[PDB]
A paper describes a structure:
We describe cryo-EM structures of the neck, the neck-capsid and neck-tail junctions, and capsid of the Agrobacterium phage Milano. The tail to capsid junction involves a symmetry mismatch that is bridged by the neck, and is therefore crucial for the assembly of tailed phage. The extensive network of disulfide bonds within and between neck, collar, capsid and tail provides an exceptional structural stability to Milano.
The 15-fold, 12-fold and 3-fold symmetrized maps of the neck were used to build atomic models of the collar, portal, and neck devoid of capsid (portal + neck 1 + neck 2 + tail terminator + collar), respectively. Namely, the dodecameric portal ring (12 × gp7), which is embedded into the capsid shell, connects sequentially to the dodecameric neck 1 ring (12 × gp14), hexameric neck 2 ring (6 × gp15) and hexameric tail terminator ring (6 × gp18). The structures of portal, neck 2, and tail terminator rings of Milano show considerable similarity to their counterparts in other bacteriophages at both protomer and oligomeric levels. The lumen of portal, neck 1, and neck 2 possesses a positive electrostatic potential resulting in a positive charge of the neck lumen —suitable to hold and position the end of the negatively charged linear dsDNA until the genome release.
Author numbering:
A (entry chain V): 54 to 320, 334 to 409
B (entry chain U): 16 to 320, 334 to 409
C (entry chain W): 264 to 315
Write the structure that this text describes.
Amino acid sequence: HPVAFRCLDKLGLTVQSVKWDVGKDPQNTQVGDGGMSASQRKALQQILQRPNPTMSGAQLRYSAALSWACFGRMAFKVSVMSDGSVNAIWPLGIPFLKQKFDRYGDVESFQYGDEAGKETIPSFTKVEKNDKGRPIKNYAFMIVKPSINGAMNFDVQNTPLQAIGVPVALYDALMARAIDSADGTPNSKWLVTASRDLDDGQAKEVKEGIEETKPGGDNGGEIIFIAGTDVKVQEMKNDLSDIHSKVPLDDQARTIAGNFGIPIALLYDESRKAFFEDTIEPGYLTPLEDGFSMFLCGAGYRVIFDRDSIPALRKSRADIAATYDKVTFITEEEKREVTGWPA
Amino acid sequence: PAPSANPAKIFIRRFFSAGVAKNVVSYSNVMAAQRAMEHPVAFRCLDKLGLTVQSVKWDVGKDPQNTQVGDGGMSASQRKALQQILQRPNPTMSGAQLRYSAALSWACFGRMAFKVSVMSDGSVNAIWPLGIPFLKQKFDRYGDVESFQYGDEAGKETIPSFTKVEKNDKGRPIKNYAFMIVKPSINGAMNFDVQNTPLQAIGVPVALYDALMARAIDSADGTPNSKWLVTASRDLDDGQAKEVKEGIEETKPGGDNGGEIIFIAGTDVKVQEMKNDLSDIHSKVPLDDQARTIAGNFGIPIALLYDESRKAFFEDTIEPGYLTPLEDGFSMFLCGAGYRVIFDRDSIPALRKSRADIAATYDKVTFITEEEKREVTGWPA
Amino acid sequence: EETKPGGDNGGEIIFIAGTDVKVQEMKNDLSDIHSKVPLDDQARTIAGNFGI
């Protein structure tokens, strides 16, 4: 669909542009830092910049955000070698990913595919852990978006596609009407009709006289003179200027755009800032980074992305930094930490 | 390191079959991209994207996230050679045209393919782009490609993929190989998936546009452009009807009696003036909408076809949709860690004022050391 | 019929000798099917009741 694909790859592109890194977390109350080795952390940095061969981190972000927007789920697979050192990360196709539950309340394994290949990858909950807590073998994530009535994993998906069936169907109906009416409506003017007493044989002469005034004819642009036997011309309107129903179409476009959380103006700069720090930041960035931080590294360290890598926020960050510079009743370290810049 | 066992074996089992050299794009997509290069709006947008991308300047450089103290610029002479090649690829083609062709094929098909000729020591000799339409690839048994077939029958070079190739003792390849940079889509299937291109979702508007323009052309020539459908009666002695006709006619600009009245004695003749509106033949309203649709689907602010909108087009669709994928694809396998291909943003003419104002504003701050004030605005060290 | 875009005689006049046929062009407005005015009001109401 035109509008739906435009919005989907807009979200994907915007998310795909942000830069990763692992770093100390701000709320580091855990003085017993969980960056278990500080070599696992270097390996995780490496992998976050270069996942599994034949795929870069940017494409990982793009696919993850796209599948999150379409289904409200995010799945992955890791290959930690033997000591919490992650080897590579693969995204999982949500459509054909099945999962199996435990007896108490949660998942244990993920089945990926129907019949030939049948790898039941273990969940992060049950897996051979290190003596510190890090896993030793492969596992999967299945990051999930919450909904009503809890049912943390037994619940129904929460995706924008739930509430745009009506507008997308209406849009397709209107556009099909437009296409059908574009070719099928006669595009001729001058429905000219003679009488039933004209000696069919000088009616042809009258027709040739009327016709040979087209641009590039014998007598082009001159009058038509008819001696006797009044012929009667009527000019057809052929409006054809509302075939797509402009008014009840832009509304469906606005609906299936706003349901994805995109300011209409995008399809001024204030609205770009809004689209960035209203739907992209707290709807794709925070869930993804919290999901990764939850189980990819120990406490005290977690995955972060640099906001100053977003080109739309640079002016705002600079003005905020200057204004804070002007204040005095604040020590330097907090003036830093209120605007990034850890220490 | 490399475990060789990815979870993409879900498709080679039965959903696909090995050793067949399946083509990368459906023929329908090739024809659509072909005839979309003649359409007015589609070609305008396509070469707009191509020109914009083609303008940016390359260089190899230290990467910012250099945690790898064991720098992978294996020789520092391979890096000089890669710089040379990035500025001058294979003879009879410059780096700019490489960027243009790459971005264009990325926009049309969602794929990017290349070929390298590293001599014997990771020193790349030249780089050639690969025509996506007639490039076929063959898969392994586990999850990925091994070789690329280029052409149907006479010439049959199965160039190896970067995955399997005679590597150096450091990791760099020794013989030729290919890339096939791919754009992701739903349901994963990293290479077994369907293309993800704007041409998917603009069939309806381009067909509607062509229909409206064909109607306009047909109606332009074919509608009589005459006025004054004047008709006499069936009692006028055909022979003074000709006299009346000559009287009416000889008032055209540059006639005997031009501009004077017409006097008809008896036998009332009756003139009616035809409107011949002809001012909406192209259907202006349901045409600009199709143009807006097939422009926005390519990610181009309507205003382009003010300066704020140019900045938006630069750092919203060109930067994170053609620049980052291309540079990450090259950096992924053209050089070792610690070094990677970068392009200078300050070479873009639209961003210069913004960069300067940001630099000054940051200059005004004090609770920030100089090196980070630099690195937040380019300027590595 | 054969004056549609891509027909034999496309865009030229229609000549009917005798037996006057009568055409009327249907409006087919179809530009208020969703009732734009008494719909945005319901949207405004169920948005403001949520405090947005």
